[PDB]
Amino acid sequence: ASPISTIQPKANFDAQQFAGTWLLVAVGSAGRRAEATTLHVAPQGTAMAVSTFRKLDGICWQVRQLYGDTGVLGRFLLQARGARGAVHVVVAETDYQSFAVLYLERAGQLSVKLYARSLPVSDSVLSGFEQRVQEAHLTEDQIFYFPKYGFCEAADQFHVLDEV
């Protein structure tokens, strides 16, 4: 049925190895200014607590979310409330140590995201991500690259949004 339902998750996905800091590199999407984005991931039971830090006009903003486990390892759900509808997430490919390719579905629309432990991303991984975007029926023109400078990973109490 849903486009993401057929996306294969990382075999034996290990949240413990996936924990830590990830940098958002690019997003392939047909929907719709990219901010330097850093994720801090931590296992929470069978789910993953995810804090995303975004730099906007010199200020760091944090959003706390919970990627709930939908059953199969590597498949998650981000609750719908206040913002928009429910978002399904799948960690499809990752070596845990350098890159991760995640697929997300919102309102029935599938998008693909590339994360890296550090920059630069290897040529093989960039080309691989592009191949996955093409296979997802998206064009190179639908790939949006995020900042490689201006990252932040700490926000004060006045710039934190808790969705959990």
Q: Which of 27, 6, 35 is nearest to 102 (CA)?
A: 27
Print burial letters for 59-82: b (CB count within 10 Å at least 16), e (below 16). ebbbbebbbbbbeebbbbbbeeee
CA distance 157 to 140: 39
Dump the DSSP string for 25-45.
EEEE-S---PPPEEEEEEEET
**Cα 45–chain centre separation:** 19
**3-state secondary structure at position 125:** helix
Query: How deeply is 142 buried, as exposed, middle or buried, from its count of CB atoms within 10 A (0-12, 13-18, 19+)?
Result: middle
Note whether 41 and 18 are within 8 A (CB): yes
Structure tokens at 41: 């991931």
Q: Which residue has the tokens 């069978």?
A: 46
Q: What are phi and psi of 70, to 5 degrees?
A: -95, 15
Structure tokens at 82: 């206040």
Q: Count CB neighbours of 130 within 10 A.
A: 16
Note whether 93 and 13 are within 8 A (CB): no
Q: Which residue has the tokens 């730099």?
A: 55
DSSP lists the bridge partners of residue 9 as none
**If you ran DSSP here, which 8-state letter would residue 111 be given?**
E
Q: Evaluate the omega torsion of the peptide bond into residue 120 and state whether it is cis, within 30 degrees of 0.
A: yes
Note whether 131 and 26 are within 8 A (CB): no
> In the chain, what are the domains?
1-164 (2.40.128.20)
CA distance 58 to 36: 11
Q: CA angle, corner 114, sides to 111 and 119, nearest 5?
A: 160
Query: How deeply is 25 buried, as exposed, middle or buried, from its count of CB atoms within 10 A (0-12, 13-18, 19+)?
Result: buried
Q: 20 CB contacts (<8 Å, ≥6 apart)?
A: 40, 41, 117
Q: Count CB neighbours of 47 within 10 A.
A: 16
Q: 39 CB contacts (<8 Å, ≥6 apart)?
A: 21, 22, 23, 24, 50, 51, 52, 53, 115
Resolution (A): 1.2
Structure tokens at 151: 């990252």
Approach to solving: X-ray
